[PDB]
Design a protein around this ligand. Structure first.
Ligand SMILES: Nc1nccc(C(F)(F)F)n1
Ligand SMILES: Nc1nccc(C(F)(F)F)n1
Ligand SMILES: [Cl-]
Ligand SMILES: [Mg+2]
Ligand SMILES: [Mg+2]
Ligand SMILES: [Mg+2]
Ligand SMILES: [Mg+2]
Lengths: 194, 195
């Protein structure tokens, strides 16, 4: 019923552009929208990956491995699933295992890979694959994991028990000025609601 | 240890602006970022709310109520939690019950309310409150739900059983060429991962 008529570039930076979107509404009336897109999206099924990294260890509760980083858009520290953009020609699964190792030091095993899902579809066309990865924390490879951050990457690893994730996030938010990512919080809420 | 030095306006629309953010990296090196902000936020706790609506009917599976809408930035239809921007002087809780009624016609009760959570913090400063709302589907006011959508809103309601949410969302994507919202998919995943 509804479809795009035109996409007019307003402003294009190195990383992000703003567009004037013209579309047909279901009454048959022309309307416009302000649309954000990234400049980095090539022939990928999505902009990026976020990794749901389930750290498994004999005689430990499963942990969810999270990262804390300064996010210039937010003007502050954010707690998020390990995540990055998919390199040209890179599979979502390879991107997920690569970003997880670079940001946390852990070497994961793929469990599942979502279709492309939308980050903020009233604002942007940005998409990710959410890749579930298990980490064998009994493997020597995953003993003393050292992050290998790229240039301008400054990442702290926070591993929280799956069985108490929402309360543990709440206790981190109570103790410091930091924002939890909406996907992490949605995931922690569902663990509670299950 | 890191902080904003300055923000340079690049482009300001009616709804969205693009800024060049200058920040101090942990080493003392000065760095720039391209940052998106909405123009609509004021004294608000957050830009918006997203409602997790648990529809509870006796002798029925518990359902999560979702909405399907054309999303101009996506150039397509998306499946999402009911959601909208918070009105100036509106509480996140009141925004949640209002948006849920306008988008779905259901009248629900606040179960819990998240702190402000970020939407895409590598790109934008956009935040929402995630508001868990229960709907007593057996009440008369939720018998024939009357959606009251504002100007230029066109919303299909899709109720999916909570206990099979992820498999049900995967099926919609396979038949219907839709995009599932990342928060919806994250919730559905954790329902399967809990056990
Ligand atoms: N980004 C954007 N563009 C046009 C209209 C809107 C509004 F839904 F919030 F009104 N947002
Ligand atoms: N929005 C934005 N600004 C600067 C650099 C980036 C990058 F992560 F994609 F590299 N993004
Ligand atoms: Cl609930
Ligand atoms: Mg990253
Ligand atoms: Mg990275
Ligand atoms: Mg609305
Ligand atoms: Mg809405």
């Amino acid at each position: 019923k509804q479809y795009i008529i035109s996409e007019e570039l307003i402003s294009e930076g190195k990383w992000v552009k703003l567009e004037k979107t013209t579309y047909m509404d279901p009454t048959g009336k022309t309307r416009t929208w302000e649309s954000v897109k990234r400049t980095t999206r090539k022939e990928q099924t999505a902009d990026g990956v976020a990794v749901i990294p389930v750290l498994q260890r004999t005689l430990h509760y499963e942990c969810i491995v999270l990262v804390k980083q300064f996010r210039p858009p937010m003007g502050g520290y954010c707690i998020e699933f390990p995540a990055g953009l998919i390199d040209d020609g890179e599979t979502p699964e390879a991107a997920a295992l690569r970003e997880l190792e670079e940001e946390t030091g852990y070497k994961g095993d793929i469990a599942e890979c979502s279709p492309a899902v939308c980050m903020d579809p009233g604002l942007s066309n940005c998409t990710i694959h959410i890749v579930t990865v298990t980490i064998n924390g009994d493997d020597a490879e995953n003993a003393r994991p050292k992050p290998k951050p790229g240039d301008g990457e400054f990442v702290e690893v926070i591993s929280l028990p799956k069985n108490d994730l929402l309360q543990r996030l709440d206790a981190l938010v109570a103790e410091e000025h930091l924002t939890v990512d909406a996907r992490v919080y949605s995931y922690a809420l569902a663990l509670k609601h299950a």
